[PDB]
Every structure is written in C-alpha cells, then in structure tokens.
Amino acid sequence: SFSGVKVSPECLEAFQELKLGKSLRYVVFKMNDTKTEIVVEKKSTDKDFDTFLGDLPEKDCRYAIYDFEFNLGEGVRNKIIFISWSPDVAPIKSKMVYSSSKDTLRRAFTGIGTDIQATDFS
Numbered sequence: 001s002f003s004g005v006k007v008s009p010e011c012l013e014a015f016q017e018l019k020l021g022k023s024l025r026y027v028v029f030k031m032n033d034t035k036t037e038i039v040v041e042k043k044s045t046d047k048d049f050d051t052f053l054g055d056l057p058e059k060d061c062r063y064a065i066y067d068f069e070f071n072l073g074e075g076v077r078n079k080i081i082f083i084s085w086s087p088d089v090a091p092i093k094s095k096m097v098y099s100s101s102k103d104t105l106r107r108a109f110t111g112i113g114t115d116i117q118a119t120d121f122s
C-alpha cells in the first residue's frame with residue numbers, strides 16, 4: 001500500500017479475540033519505532049471504563065478498540081468502537097503519522113460498530 005504500514009499479526013489476533021471470543025474488553029495500538037508497523041501496546045479484560053482511560057497516553061497518539069456495552073431498552077447490546085486518540089498536545093509529527101496510518105488499521109478490522117476521533121485538551 002501507499003502508507004507501507006503493516007498491521008502486526010498480534011493486532012489482528014487481539015481484535016478477533018475481542019470480537020469472536022469476547023475475552024477482551026479493549027486493545028490499545030501504537031506505531032512501532034520505525035513507523036512501519038502498528039502493534040499492540042496493551043490489551044485488557046477490565047470492564048471499568050476509567051481503567052481504559054488510564055491506559056491512553058497524555059502526550060502521544062494511539063488507536064484503540066473498545067467493546068462497548070449499553071442499554072437502550074430492547075436488550076443489553078454492544079458495539080465495537082474504533083478510536084483514534086490524538087491529544088491536542090501531542091507533537092504535530094505524531095498526529096500526522098497516526099492520521100496517515102489510520103486507514104491501514106481501520107480497513108483491517110471488520111465489524112466496527114462506531115468510529116470515534118477524540119481530541120483531548122490539557
């Protein structure tokens with residue numbers, strides 16, 4: 001592809017496990033040092049949203065998938081959320097690299113229920 005970015009096998013496996021095995025609540029992904037591959041930084045079974053927030057970087061970008069459960073009234077449901085985490089304070093170079101590499105990861109995952117772009121401020 002143009003980006004030349006590869007999605008590590010672990011990324012696919014973690015996503016599949018979360019979707020098919022329901023044995024993971026969330027996964028946080030990051031670019032490797034050479035910016036040639038997206039890898040897994042963290043995976044968790046913790047259902048507490050605050051714990052998830054605690055695993056997101058304050059000064060760097062990341063991507064994440066979260067198995068979101070909610071109740072609208074017709075039966076507890078869930079949606080796999082694809083998240084682009086790009087803090088306002090993160091270096092412009094990083095925001096650019098992650099923005100340019102996002103589609104590579106996104107197109108590798110099927111079954112995404114909601115796409116979220118989050119820009120947190122200090």
Ligand SMILES: CCCCCCCCCCCC[N+](C)(C)[O-]
Pocket residue numbers: 053054055056057058118120
């Ligand atoms: C409607 C849900 C929106 C959730 C957005 C999350 C807001 C909390 C941002 C705190 C970021 C956590 N931190 C400092 C450790 O990086």
